[PDB]
Structure formats: C-alpha cells, structure tokens
C-alpha cells in the first residue's frame, strides 16, 4: 500500500509512515538505508525487489 | 539430557574432551591436535613418561 500512512513490518523491522517510489539504487549486499540520525529512510521489498 | 541414547552399560568411551592445554582458546576456535603435553621441564620426545 502506497501514499497512505500505514503500520509496516519489513523483514522484521516495524514502523509507521508513508511509502513511496525512490530513485536510489542499492548494491546487491544492501537491504536498508539510513540518514544522518541513523533512522531508516529506504527499504528494498523482499518480493518485488 | 540424553542418558537413554549416549549411555552404555559397560561404559561408553567414544566422547572425548581436551585436558592439558598451553593457553586459553579464543572465541569460536577449534583445536584438534594430538600432541604430548609437557608439564615439567623435561624435554618430551613424543613419549608419555
């Protein structure tokens, strides 16, 4: 579900927020992305990739 | 507990432990050496006396 405030669990990581499509590109040894405050700002979907 | 599988009436002697090492192991380390351990200062020539 996109563009709606949801509770989510991604591979065990829980949280709350809005999910959108990104322009980033992860190297194959990466699943999560952090910001300056160590908070999770990006995630790879384990089915669609 | 496994006293119903790994126990034998006359005594099971197929499970071994290491005594008499020179120094202490490091985490997740494995030593499978079979060498004669020198307790005193006599120079063991690969025999047990």
């Amino acid at each position: 579900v996109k563009n709606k405030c949801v509770n989510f669990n991604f591979n065990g990581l829980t949280g709350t927020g809005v999910l959108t499509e990104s322009n980033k590109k992860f190297l194959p040894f990466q699943q999560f992305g952090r910001d300056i405050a160590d908070t999770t700002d990006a995630v790879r979907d384990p089915q669609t990739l | 507990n496994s006293n119903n599988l790994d126990s034998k009436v006359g005594g099971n002697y197929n499970y071994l432990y290491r005594l008499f090492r020179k120094s202490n192991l490091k985490p997740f380390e494995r030593d499978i050496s079979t060498e004669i351990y020198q307790a005193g200062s006599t120079p063991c020539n690969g025999v047990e006396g």
């Binding site: 980033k24 590109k25 992860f26 190297l27 040894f29 990466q30 699943q31 999560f32 992305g33 952090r34 300056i36 990006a42 | 490091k26 985490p27 997740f28 380390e29 494995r30 499978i32 050496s33 060498e35």
Partner: protein, 221 residues
C-alpha cells in the same frame, strides 16, 4: 616436491573498504576499524627473480598484485605450516576455486605449473568450497570468521578506490603466517609478478559518501 635485498614503497590513500552493509547518501561518516594507515611503508616483491617468502600476518593484511598474465594464484595461511596444526589454502587451479581447510604437509618451495606442487598430504578436512590490472585484496580474521574484501581496476597507482565485501568463512583456526602461490614457466623462467604487502591497525577514519552512495574520499585523523 622440488627445492629450487628488500625493497619498499609508499601507500598513499589505498586500502579503504565499506565497513557496513548499509546504504548512505551525501554524508560524512566517521568509523573506527582495522585500516591500513595512510602514507605507510609497503613491502614490494618482484619476479633470476622469485620472491615467495613466509611473511607475518599480525592483525590483517592488505595485498596488491600488478600482473598481466595471471601468475599469482592464491595463498596458504596458518601458524606452523606442517601436519601438527590446521591450515587454510586458497587457490585457483586455472579452472576452479578451492579453499579446503585441512591439516596440510606443505613443501618449502610450493608452486604451480604453466604442475600442482603445493603439499604432500591432507588428513582431516573441516571445510570445502570447491566451485594491466591491479586486483587489490584485504584479509581479516576475527572470532572464527575469515573476511575477504576485493576490488579490480585496469590501471603503485595514486588514486582512491574502496573495496567491497566478497566473502566470510567460518574456519575457526589460529593464523600467524602466510605465503604466496606463484606459477613458473616451462629449468624455469619467471614473469611480471610484482606484489605489494602491508599491515593493518586500528584507526578512526572520516569517509565521504556521495549522492549515488559511493565512497570518494577519506581522512585519517
């Protein structure tokens, strides 16, 4: 089995790798880890010329090899490279890759052929994973895990390139010495086999991640 003046150079800004598996963008990030200090004195071995001595492995190793015909094959790591201790052997046999932790009886002048003369015996195996260039490598050994990082570049250079995770191995052994594996030609002839060796120690670095998530510069504090 067949029984057949040092040099130095400077490592400017080499031996940097990704410490985490996390993606970061347009930031400066500081981290403490085992790194190769900047502007360090680095040992150089050429290839008559045939340098394959036993070198120390203190707390990790940086390795570089500038070849053009693939004569540096792999390595052997251990403590006492005889049948009394366990030892690790990484080798490319020209068609496959082998790692094969075992109890090896190693020869004094091990080498390959343009043919396989490395060891005399192998008794107890605990692991098997049989499966104009620069080719930098980094080796570490922490808590029973042998870590490898690697990077490839066409064209010691004086730039910046960060090494990427390659593999971790659960081998569980004490490692104190290592030795390089070379292949000699056809009595024998050598070739271009310059290889460079360094040593790591704990340092706090400041790395710079660009907008695509790539490390482009670093500072040694």
């Amino acid at each position: 089995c067949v029984n057949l003046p040092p040099a130095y150079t400077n490592s400017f800004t080499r031996g940097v790798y990704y410490p985490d598996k996390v993606f970061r963008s347009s930031v400066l990030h500081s981290t403490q880890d085992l790194f190769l200090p900047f502007f360090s004195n680095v040992t150089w071995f050429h290839a008559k010329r045939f340098d394959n001595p036993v070198l120390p492995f203190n707390d990790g190793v940086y390795f570089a090899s500038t070849e053009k015909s693939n004569i540096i094959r792999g390595w052997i790591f251990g403590t006492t490279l005889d049948s009394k201790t366990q030892s690790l052997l990484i080798v490319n046999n020209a068609t496959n890759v082998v790692i094969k932790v075992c109890e090896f009886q190693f020869c004094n002048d091990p080498f390959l052929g343009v043919e396989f003369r490395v060891y005399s015996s192998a008794n107890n195996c605990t692991f098997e994973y049989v499966s104009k260039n620069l080719r930098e490598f980094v080796f570490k050994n922490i808590d029973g895990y042998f870590k490898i990082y690697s990077k490839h570049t066409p064209i010691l250079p004086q730039g910046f390139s960060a090494l990427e995770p390659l593999v971790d191995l659960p081998i569980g052994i004490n490692i104190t010495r290592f030795q390089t594996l070379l292949a000699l030609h056809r009595g024998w002839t050598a070739g271009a086999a310059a290889y460079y060796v360094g040593y790591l120690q704990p340092r706090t670095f400041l790395l710079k991640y660009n907008e695509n998530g790539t490390i482009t510069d670093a500072v040694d504090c």
